[PDB]
Design a protein around this motif. Structure first.
Motif, PDB file in Angstrom:
ATOM      1  N   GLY B   5       0.777  -1.219   0.000  1.00 23.71           N
ATOM      2  CA  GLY B   5       0.000   0.000   0.000  1.00 23.71           C
ATOM      3  C   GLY B   5       0.812   1.274   0.000  1.00 23.71           C
ATOM      4  N   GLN B   6       2.138   1.184  -0.067  1.00 23.31           N
ATOM      5  CA  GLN B   6       2.998   2.353  -0.006  1.00 23.31           C
ATOM      6  C   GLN B   6       3.293   2.885  -1.405  1.00 23.31           C
ATOM      7  OE1 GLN B   6       3.496   2.542   3.331  1.00 23.31           O
ATOM      8  NE2 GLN B   6       5.189   3.956   3.753  1.00 23.31           N
ATOM      9  N   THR B   7       3.646   4.168  -1.459  1.00 23.58           N
ATOM     10  CA  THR B   7       4.027   4.842  -2.691  1.00 23.58           C
ATOM     11  C   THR B   7       5.319   5.623  -2.479  1.00 23.58           C
ATOM     12  OG1 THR B   7       3.309   6.395  -4.421  1.00 23.58           O
ATOM     13  CG2 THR B   7       2.563   6.854  -2.160  1.00 23.58           C
ATOM     14  N   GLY B   8       5.984   5.912  -3.586  1.00 19.90           N
ATOM     15  CA  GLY B   8       7.221   6.664  -3.590  1.00 19.90           C
ATOM     16  C   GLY B   8       8.123   6.164  -4.699  1.00 19.90           C
ATOM     17  N   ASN B   9       9.343   6.710  -4.740  1.00 14.76           N
ATOM     18  CA  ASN B   9      10.252   6.382  -5.842  1.00 14.76           C
ATOM     19  C   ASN B   9      10.611   4.900  -5.881  1.00 14.76           C
ATOM     20  OD1 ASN B   9      11.573   6.658  -3.417  1.00 14.76           O
ATOM     21  ND2 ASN B   9      13.309   7.839  -4.214  1.00 14.76           N
ATOM     22  N   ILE B  10      10.640   4.247  -4.727  1.00 13.53           N
ATOM     23  CA  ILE B  10      11.007   2.837  -4.671  1.00 13.53           C
ATOM     24  C   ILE B  10       9.781   1.974  -4.879  1.00 13.53           C
ATOM     25  CG2 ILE B  10      11.922   1.026  -3.165  1.00 13.53           C
ATOM     26  CD1 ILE B  10      13.722   3.364  -1.949  1.00 13.53           C
ATOM     27  N   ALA B  11       8.713   2.274  -4.140  1.00  9.14           N
ATOM     28  CA  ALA B  11       7.482   1.522  -4.299  1.00  9.14           C
ATOM     29  C   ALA B  11       6.942   1.672  -5.721  1.00  9.14           C
ATOM     30  CB  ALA B  11       6.453   1.989  -3.269  1.00  9.14           C
ATOM     31  N   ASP B  12       7.141   2.846  -6.336  1.00  9.88           N
ATOM     32  CA  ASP B  12       6.612   3.080  -7.677  1.00  9.88           C
ATOM     33  C   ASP B  12       7.485   2.523  -8.797  1.00  9.88           C
ATOM     34  OD1 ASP B  12       4.697   4.403  -6.246  1.00  9.88           O
ATOM     35  OD2 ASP B  12       5.147   6.406  -7.031  1.00  9.88           O
ATOM     36  N   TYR B  13       8.829   2.627  -8.714  1.00 13.16           N
ATOM     37  CA  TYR B  13       9.656   2.241  -9.859  1.00 13.16           C
ATOM     38  C   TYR B  13      10.730   1.194  -9.602  1.00 13.16           C
ATOM     39  CZ  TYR B  13       7.576   6.654 -11.349  1.00 13.16           C
ATOM     40  OH  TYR B  13       6.698   7.671 -11.646  1.00 13.16           O
ATOM     41  N   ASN B  14      11.006   0.818  -8.352  1.00 12.31           N
ATOM     42  CA  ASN B  14      12.090  -0.112  -8.049  1.00 12.31           C
ATOM     43  C   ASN B  14      11.613  -1.444  -7.483  1.00 12.31           C
ATOM     44  OD1 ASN B  14      14.070   1.608  -9.027  1.00 12.31           O
ATOM     45  ND2 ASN B  14      14.614   2.531  -7.065  1.00 12.31           N
ATOM     46  N   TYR B  15      10.880  -1.449  -6.370  1.00 13.17           N
ATOM     47  CA  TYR B  15      10.453  -2.693  -5.732  1.00 13.17           C
ATOM     48  C   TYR B  15       9.038  -2.512  -5.216  1.00 13.17           C
ATOM     49  CZ  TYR B  15      10.240  -6.842  -2.761  1.00 13.17           C
ATOM     50  OH  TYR B  15       9.874  -8.034  -2.178  1.00 13.17           O
ATOM     51  N   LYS B  16       8.116  -3.342  -5.702  1.00  5.85           N
ATOM     52  CA  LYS B  16       6.710  -3.267  -5.328  1.00  5.85           C
ATOM     53  C   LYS B  16       6.247  -4.641  -4.875  1.00  5.85           C
ATOM     54  CE  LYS B  16       4.548  -1.014  -4.057  1.00  5.85           C
ATOM     55  NZ  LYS B  16       3.655  -0.384  -3.054  1.00  5.85           N
ATOM     56  N   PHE B  48      12.358   7.190 -12.709  1.00  8.41           N
ATOM     57  CA  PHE B  48      11.525   7.615 -13.829  1.00  8.41           C
ATOM     58  C   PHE B  48      11.009   6.344 -14.480  1.00  8.41           C
ATOM     59  CE2 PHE B  48      15.316  10.508 -13.960  1.00  8.41           C
ATOM     60  CZ  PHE B  48      14.722  11.641 -13.433  1.00  8.41           C
ATOM     61  N   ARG B  49       9.786   6.370 -15.001  1.00  8.79           N
ATOM     62  CA  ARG B  49       9.339   5.208 -15.764  1.00  8.79           C
ATOM     63  C   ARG B  49       8.071   5.594 -16.515  1.00  8.79           C
ATOM     64  NH1 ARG B  49       6.522  -0.089 -14.791  1.00  8.79           N
ATOM     65  NH2 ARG B  49       7.780  -1.847 -15.535  1.00  8.79           N
ATOM     66  N   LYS B  50       7.702   4.749 -17.480  1.00  9.98           N
ATOM     67  CA  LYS B  50       6.402   4.877 -18.129  1.00  9.98           C
ATOM     68  C   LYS B  50       5.256   4.676 -17.143  1.00  9.98           C
ATOM     69  CE  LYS B  50       8.379   5.467 -22.157  1.00  9.98           C
ATOM     70  NZ  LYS B  50       8.355   6.764 -22.887  1.00  9.98           N
TER      71      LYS B  50
ATOM     72  N   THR C  27      -2.028   8.030  -5.200  1.00  9.90           N
ATOM     73  CA  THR C  27      -2.047   7.555  -6.580  1.00  9.90           C
ATOM     74  C   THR C  27      -3.458   7.554  -7.182  1.00  9.90           C
ATOM     75  OG1 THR C  27      -2.205   5.175  -6.040  1.00  9.90           O
ATOM     76  CG2 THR C  27       0.003   6.134  -6.218  1.00  9.90           C
ATOM     77  N   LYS C  28      -4.512   7.713  -6.383  1.00  9.29           N
ATOM     78  CA  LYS C  28      -5.880   7.858  -6.864  1.00  9.29           C
ATOM     79  C   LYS C  28      -6.276   9.321  -7.021  1.00  9.29           C
ATOM     80  CE  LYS C  28      -7.249   3.477  -6.955  1.00  9.29           C
ATOM     81  NZ  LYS C  28      -7.662   2.844  -8.243  1.00  9.29           N
ATOM     82  N   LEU C  29      -5.378  10.246  -6.678  1.00  5.10           N
ATOM     83  CA  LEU C  29      -5.610  11.680  -6.721  1.00  5.10           C
ATOM     84  C   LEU C  29      -5.517  12.269  -8.126  1.00  5.10           C
ATOM     85  CD1 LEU C  29      -3.618  12.646  -3.495  1.00  5.10           C
ATOM     86  CD2 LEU C  29      -6.106  12.569  -3.727  1.00  5.10           C
ATOM     87  N   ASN C  30      -5.199  11.473  -9.155  1.00  4.46           N
ATOM     88  CA  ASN C  30      -5.116  11.990 -10.516  1.00  4.46           C
ATOM     89  C   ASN C  30      -6.424  11.837 -11.294  1.00  4.46           C
ATOM     90  OD1 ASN C  30      -2.329  12.877 -10.565  1.00  4.46           O
ATOM     91  ND2 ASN C  30      -1.760  10.706 -10.491  1.00  4.46           N
ATOM     92  N   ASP C  31      -7.480  11.356 -10.645  1.00  4.46           N
ATOM     93  CA  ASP C  31      -8.847  11.376 -11.136  1.00  4.46           C
ATOM     94  C   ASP C  31      -9.461  12.573 -10.423  1.00  4.46           C
ATOM     95  OD1 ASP C  31      -8.377   9.192 -12.716  1.00  4.46           O
ATOM     96  OD2 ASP C  31      -9.401   7.754 -11.416  1.00  4.46           O
ATOM     97  N   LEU C  32     -10.758  12.837 -10.619  1.00  3.87           N
ATOM     98  CA  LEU C  32     -11.327  13.983  -9.918  1.00  3.87           C
ATOM     99  C   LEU C  32     -11.138  13.709  -8.430  1.00  3.87           C
ATOM    100  CD1 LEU C  32     -13.608  15.789  -8.376  1.00  3.87           C
ATOM    101  CD2 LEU C  32     -12.987  16.605 -10.672  1.00  3.87           C
TER     102      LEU C  32
END
Lengths: 50, 50, 50
Positions: B5-16, B48-50, C27-32
């Protein structure tokens, strides 16, 4: 009429609309809000059928 | 940051982790093994990532 | 108001001590995500952040 009107109730959830729960929350919290709505709908269906 | 349930540079693009992940996350301070006064090129984040 | 808010900029501005959302998840904040936006800015002690 009662069974349909029960769908508008929140039963403790943030919102009575299932799509709002899925749109606003990530899976692990949305599952809890959905479980609350499921419990309320299950109670309404069992009452109706009984 | 390494948790469901976490977000950030690692949770988003490195290790999820999956949001139904089970298991243990063990962490300890490694300052006396990994640190270099000049830094260490080998460690980075995708950032950075798509 | 009258803004097309983009929330990845918050992660660009600083690493955070806390980022707790109620009724919505990151991450759900990019919708309304907002209707009437108010930003309350203040300085407190770390022990009072909770």
């Amino acid at each position: 009429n009662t069974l349909v009107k029960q769908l508008s109730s929140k039963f403790g959830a943030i919102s009575s609309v299932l799509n709002d729960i899925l749109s606003r929350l990530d899976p692990p919290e949305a599952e809890v809000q959905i479980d609350r709505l499921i419990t309320g709908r299950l109670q309404s269906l069992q009452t109706y059928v009984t | 940051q390494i948790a469901p349930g976490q977000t950030g540079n690692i949770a988003d693009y490195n290790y999820k982790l999956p949001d139904d992940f089970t298991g243990c996350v063990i962490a300890w301070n490694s300052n006396k093994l990994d640190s270099k006064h000049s830094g260490n090129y080998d460690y980075w984040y995708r950032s950075f990532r798509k | 108001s009258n803004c097309v808010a983009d929330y990845s900029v918050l992660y660009n501005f600083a690493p955070f001590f806390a980022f707790k959302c109620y009724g919505v998840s990151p991450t759900k904040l990019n919708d309304l995500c907002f209707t009437n936006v108010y930003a309350d800015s203040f300085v407190i002690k770390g022990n009072e952040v909770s």
